[PDB]
Amino acid sequence: AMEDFVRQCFNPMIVELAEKAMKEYGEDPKIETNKFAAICTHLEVCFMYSDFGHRFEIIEGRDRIMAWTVVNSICNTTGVEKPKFLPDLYDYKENRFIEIGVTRREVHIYYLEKANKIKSEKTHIHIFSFTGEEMATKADYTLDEESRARIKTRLFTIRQEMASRSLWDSFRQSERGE
Ligand SMILES: Cc1cc(=O)c(O)c(C(=O)O)o1
Ligand SMILES: [Mn+2]
Ligand SMILES: [Mn+2]
Incomplete structure (x- = not known):
């Protein structure tokens, strides 16, 4: 059901990229179905965030x-410090990397967890939930209200599609993909 949901609610390029990534790390999308859904979800959010500028470079x-x-x-041409971990985007307007988080827990909880993972990076963090909450470093949300609204609508819509299919309860109590 979850596997079907993913193939039927996300764009084939996204499903294919998600699937490939999993398979190269010897993970089965048919088994780790919540992880699959999370990877697709996060991928789509990154793409959506990118497609709101050429403001952003997709990583x-x-x-x-x-x-x-x-x-x-980017580092050679801007002088900005290299991160240890691959971030999600670069913002050529604010001249900072962005890490994008998508979580089914409280946004401040995930924010801390992410901020701790990459502390000692100057990377901007922007967290979204499936409830329409976000948290971003210095409450700088980078995007305008309409773009933010579109991401949150899409996240909430995935949530409710999952609930239509009685999948949301599995998904929300999992953290695989975060
Ligand atoms: C688990 C996880 C969460 C993310 O938000 C993320 O960008 C990545 C990543 O780039 O590998 O991994
Ligand atoms: Mn990433
Ligand atoms: Mn991310």
């Missing part, structure tokens, strides 16, 4: 060679 969703090539290239 997530590429292979690691391409991802680090983009990062090194």
Whole structure:
């Protein structure tokens, strides 16, 4: 059911990218179905965030060679410090990397968990939930209200589609993919 939901509610490029990533790390999308749903969800949010500028450079969703090539290239041309972990986007307006979090827990909880993982990075963090809450470093939300609204609508819609199919309860009590 969850597997069907993913193939039927996300765009094939996203499903394919999610699927590939899982398979290369020897994870089965048919088994880790909540993880699959989470990967697709996070991928879509990153793409949606990208498609609101050429304000943003998309890092997530590429292979690691391409991802680090983009990062090194941004670092050389801007002077900005290299992160230890691949972030999700670069913002050429604010001239900072962004880490995007999508969580089924409280936003402040996930925010802390992410901020702790990459502390000593100057990376901007922007967390979204499936309840329309967000949290961003310095309450700087980067995007305008309409763009933010569109991401939250999409997240809430995924949530409610899951609930239509009695999948939301499994999904929410899982953290796999965060
Ligand atoms: C588990 C997790 C959560 C993310 O938000 C993220 O961007 C990544 C990633 O880029 O690997 O991994
Ligand atoms: Mn990422
Ligand atoms: Mn992320």
